[PDB]
């Protein structure tokens, strides 16, 4: 019967925002107790999934590095299933997996625009959640293939609904975020409102919750297609709309998804994942 204080120490990081008004922890390096959590979740025999898509040139450029790194840093000490959606299985890189890692590969149709490739994920993930994932995992993360694990990315990140603070905006003012601002779009957020700017290529929660994230995001993607319109940052735009209405029970610091082009500020203590360079 886990308490927040059993594992979370917000005062270890006083220079940053460690909790939200709706009372969700923003998880920053130095704030979490991975050993206590590891013991608690292992006792419950939890299983964590991870979807990743790679279509076209993204297979040779990104997938090996994503999977190789995931194997060594993702939920170590816990059964993890990699869900790999590719258009061409014959180019799939062949990697040795360590203990408590397994996977299964699916063939997908390769969408024509790369914008649709990225946006179809929302449909595809939800179909998989219904078909199998709901039966297989207790928690699930969905991620861009053009990222790499740099260090441990563990059970401290688990919750009902998990969002990623986007690296370029965590410090910024809500009136400056790159939200979709055209009212003609489903992703629309008015000025004056919004809590954080979240990342498109990293989110998670229970299968139940991720089905809701994806279903609502794609409903708004479909609706935008029917008004001759396309959100600024596509699926990330709809994800931000969605998280404004349905607040995430957990937010991850930019340490969990850093862009090195920004440099390295004093805030970013130990990078767990960054963008492939
Ligand atoms: O040709 C493509 C285009 C996109 N993607 C997938 O769609 C995601 C989102 O695209 P991208 O990373 O290019 O978004 P960006 O990070 O540039 O905003 C990628 O991470 C891939 O998983 C892909 O596999 N092949
Ligand atoms: Mn990406």
Swiss-Prot record:
Glycans are attached at residue 212. Pathway: Protein modification; protein glycosylation. Its main location: Golgi. Substrate binds at residues 53-58, 144-146, 166-169, 178. Binds 1 Mn(2+) ion per subunit. It is an enzyme of class 2 (transferase). Belongs to the glycosyltransferase 6 family. This is N-acetyllactosaminide alpha-1,3-galactosyltransferase. The chain holds residues 82 to 358 of 368 of the full protein.
């Amino acid at each position: 019967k886990l308490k927040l204080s059993d594992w979370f120490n917000p005062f270890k990081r006083p220079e940053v925002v460690t909790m939200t008004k709706w009372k969700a922890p923003v998880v920053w390096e130095g704030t979490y107790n991975r050993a206590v959590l590891d013991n608690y979740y292992a006792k419950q025999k939890i299983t964590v999934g991870l979807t990743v898509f790679a279509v076209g040139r993204y297979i040779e450029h990104y997938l090996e590095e994503f999977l190789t790194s995931a194997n060594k840093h993702f939920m170590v000490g816990h059964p993890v299933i990699f869900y790999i959606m590719v258009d061409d299985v014959s180019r799939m890189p062949l990697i040795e997996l360590g203990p408590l890692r397994s996977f299964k590969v699916f063939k997908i149709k390769p969408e024509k625009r790369w914008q649709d490739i990225s946006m179809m994920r929302m449909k595809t993930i939800g179909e998989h959640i219904v078909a199998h994932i709901q039966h297989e995992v207790d928690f699930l993360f969905c991620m861009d293939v053009d990222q790499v694990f740099q260090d441990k990315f563990g059970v401290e990140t688990l919750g009902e609904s998990v969002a990623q603070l986007q690296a370029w905006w965590y410090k910024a003012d809500p009136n400056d975020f790159t939200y979709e601002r055209r009212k003609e779009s489903a992703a629309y957020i008015p000025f004056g409102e919004g809590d954080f700017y979240y990342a498109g290529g990293l989110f998670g929660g229970t299968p139940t919750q991720v089905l809701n994230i994806t279903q609502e995001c794609f409903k708004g993607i479909l609706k935008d297609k029917k008004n001759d319109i396309e959100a600024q940052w596509h699926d990330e735009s709809h994800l931000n709309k969605y998280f404004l209405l349905n607040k995430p029970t957990k937010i991850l610091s930019p340490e969990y998804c850093w862009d090195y082009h920004i440099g390295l500020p004093a805030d970013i203590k130990l990078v767990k994942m960054s963008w492939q360079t």
